[PDB]
DNA sequence: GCTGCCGGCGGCTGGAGAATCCCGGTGCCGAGGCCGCTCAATTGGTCGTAGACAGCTCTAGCACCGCTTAAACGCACGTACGCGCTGTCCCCCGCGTTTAAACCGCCAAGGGGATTACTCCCTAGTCTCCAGGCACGTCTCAGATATATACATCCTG
DNA sequence: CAGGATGTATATATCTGAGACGTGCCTGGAGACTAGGGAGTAATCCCCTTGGCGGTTTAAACGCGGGGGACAGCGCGTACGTGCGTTTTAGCGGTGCTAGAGCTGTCTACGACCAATTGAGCGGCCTGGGCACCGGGATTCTCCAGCCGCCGGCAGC
């Protein structure tokens, strides 16, 4: 007995079993290997941790405690590498990045 | 009834592992749920096509690796592979 | 008198100050007077394109209600995916 | 006597004000009426959920803001300050939407 | 008598007429192949290139440049000029969504 | 005269012919470097994916199907070399 | 008993068997119906016939007897609807449609 | 003299002879036709399978193909294709 | 007034350099007959998705009115628009000539592709029990409001 | 070219209370424990097609030199889009109200799967000859620069 979760052995916080079930029932391939769910879970964890840490820093800069879509937008749009990945997507209640053309500004 | 799956708990844990003193709103959590759901398919479809491309039949870490190399732009992918390898090199050592 | 209350000329409901606010958010300084119809036309055609797919999704589903899922679904089909509505 | 600002001063203030807020800019009821008017021609006697209504509103909002950005760029290219429909149909055709 | 020299801007229209019916490539094959081989060195050393792939890449890059130049000409004409400048190229790549 | 970088291999008359096929009438004196840069960038952005595809299959040659597949990934399909 | 092809019974010039086998081996779904291959073959036959006729008209126009990629490009780009269908496809040896801006023309 | 391949050459040529009984086709154009047919088939099949899974079903039927066609071909092609497909499938089921 | 007088004005003439047509010889390569094999058509039984009926019931469109806030109308006016003159110098466009790509042929060999014996990894099957979704249940500290001061304009001298 | 007055912004005080964060329950699906047999894996060999070489030659690139007209700058008329006051009109809301359409559960039956035989559709490999290629030469086809008759100002009276 003494069952152990695969995530605990892999040292991850994501449902390896859930990802493995999704791979089987997604009709992606006839047969599925073993390390693929672990790799995919690790990649997802890395991306989500990076995004969430950036959003948290952005929210802290605004002197707020919680996270709102405005902070998510302000964190995503300020990273060009992340901008390339999320170029063709839009988030609800995000607003726009404040920018003003220099010509329209007064003379001095 | 009719339980619906979600990624709320694990996203909350990941948030706690980086910021132990910051909360999250309602919509700000569904946004991250949708982002994860999008990326999952965006990687799995590419991996599936790549496996079919060589007339293979099983998905292994190698095609997922190539998918990560193609999708994530540059330096980010440069990091990801390492952790990915890390994430498996322990698991095979102790199943 | 149960249903089929066909209305007309509701495109004019998009008032001028709303367009002024949208343009100010865009970041323009001066606004002409001839754009008030071109914007109303491009918005209308965009709505037709979205609603066609939105409706045919339900038609395939053989239902009589249009949910949010279908709207997001058709927006993703034409490469305009949208986060924050349970994709 | 009474204080009148130089022309174009209030435009700059509205620019830096609205660029910060995040709420919608179009009233919900006229938009719903327009959506209901359009939906009839495809299949009559339908039924709408709200979440679809504000989803459509947000999508149209984003599209219009994106179009206005390129319109401003084309206008400022031509050594002008206002915007004309010609910039709009230039931007819509360079993108390839109307090509 | 004086030698017959054409008025400015006519031979250009003649080439415009001639080239728009042609289908062949307009870039020398050997320099392009050498450029491709040189630029592929960084990713991996000692690679072999099949013949068909080089011409495929060639005509793909020909079509891309043709489209970009057409859009640039349209943008330049929009500005009540007849000459094209690098800023028109930059603005076109701004609007189409490639540089940013 | 043999030391010539392959990027210089794109001669100016070739650029002129490409522009004429595009439909332009007059050309200034600075397009010839912007075009060279754009060409190089677009070349790398496809050769990277193609070469990666070669690496995955353990081969050592860049076959036609590989290059057309990578072009299809970028959003520019190709007809004629198979598919 | 004597055998006969499915296309003969459906009056088609496209192979039902090959398309059905492709539907099986294409990973697309777990099970496939019966009318789906016939429907898909009919649609493909329609599209191919229309393209072939449109190319043949242009081929006969320039006093030729065999079709050339240039003729295919000319037929595709001259029909706006089919142009929308094939908006981003590039055809090898297709050249470009002849067109000249009005301003670039002389005064008269 | 081995590893036989597959293509759509014969059917395309057969259709050609039923439209222009005096016209031929070069090799490059024929390959272009083959590639276009493959691309369209892949697109339609992918859309149909996606829709079949979207409603959590498990079988692909004629209805899925019809909706996929309606979702891709703009206008005239859509109705012409659905009409010809319907008449063809009715012909098939009527004559077993 | 009216003589030249002068420069343009468009209208026409004809030379000039380019693009087009057809004829006549020559190939290279789609189009068709041939052989066979390999997969598609014929039979045959099953058992489990999918169609029906038969229910329950959450919720979306109607209506009703009180408030009120932003939408519609007009109104001085200055500023950014559009046109017109203009001074070049920088691209267009032939010419000599200098050069590298294109053709053509002969080689070597490393890597791509077909064949084969096999092994051990993931699927097929059961039993089991604990992580996660649902229903609450709150008190939070998250916001929401109201208040009070510095600030950057546009005028003045 | 330096101050004053201003309507804006900024900060800071109270509420204040819908809903992030636990807190339990229970369930169904994820982990523990059994072969097997077929999918990939080395190992082999056998072509082949690609990198490489070395003479011509000949059409394309290159640097020069001459020239004219598109372009950025400057200036002026002007008219219409902006800041502001005065209605008023439809949005927001808050309250019920109702049946319609959306959700789930049972039962049955039929059609897609899979396995075993048998024959013909098509993929390969020559093979003859026919439509596109190429050349020169006659045939038109626009492009241009100057000549000429006319015309409207321009010095005088």
Numbering used by the authors:
A (entry chain K), G (entry chain R): 12 to 119
B (entry chain M): 28 to 122
C (entry chain Q): 16 to 102
D (entry chain O): 37 to 135
E (entry chain I): 36 to 135
F (entry chain J): 20 to 102
H (entry chain S): 27 to 122
Q: What is written in the article reporting this PDB entry?
A:
Polycomb repressive complex 2 (PRC2) trimethylates histone H3 on K27 (H3K27me3) leading to gene silencing that is essential for embryonic development and maintenance of cell identity. The interaction of PRC2 with substrate nucleosomes involves mainly two structural elements within the catalytic subunit EZH2, the bridge helix and the CXC domain. A central mechanism of PRC2 activation is the recognition of PRC2-trimethylated lysine peptides by its EED subunit, resulting in conformational changes within PRC2 that lead to the allosteric activation of the complex. We discovered that H3K4me3-containing and H3K36me3-containing nucleosomes inhibit PRC2 using two distinct mechanisms because of the differences in their positions along the histone H3 tail.
Previous biochemical data showed that PRC2 can be activated on H3K4me3-modified nucleosome substrates in the presence of high local concentrations of allosteric activator (either excess H3K27me3 peptide or PRC2 complexes copurified with methylated JARID2). We, therefore, determined the structure of PRC2AJ1–450, thus including JARID2K116me3, bound to an H3K4me3-modified nucleosome at 3.5-Å resolution. In this structure, we observed an activated state of PRC2, with density consistent with JARID2K116me3 occupying the EED regulatory site, bent SBD and folded SRM. Importantly, we could not locate the histone H3K4me3 modification elsewhere in this reconstruction, supporting that JARID2K116me3 and H3K4me3 compete for the same binding site. Although the activated state was prevalent in our data, careful sorting for occupancy of the SRM led us to identify a second, rarer state (resolution limited to 8 Å) in which the SRM is unfolded and the SBD is extended, although the EED regulatory site remains occupied. The existence of both allosterically activated and inactivated PRC2 states in the cryo-EM data agrees with previous biochemical observations concerning activity under conditions including allosteric activators and suggests that JARID2 and H3K4me3 are mutually exclusive binders of the EED regulatory site. At actively transcribed promoters, where chromatin is highly decorated with H3K4me3 and low in H3K27me3, the high local concentration of this mark may outcompete activators for the EED regulatory site, thus acting as an allosteric antagonist.
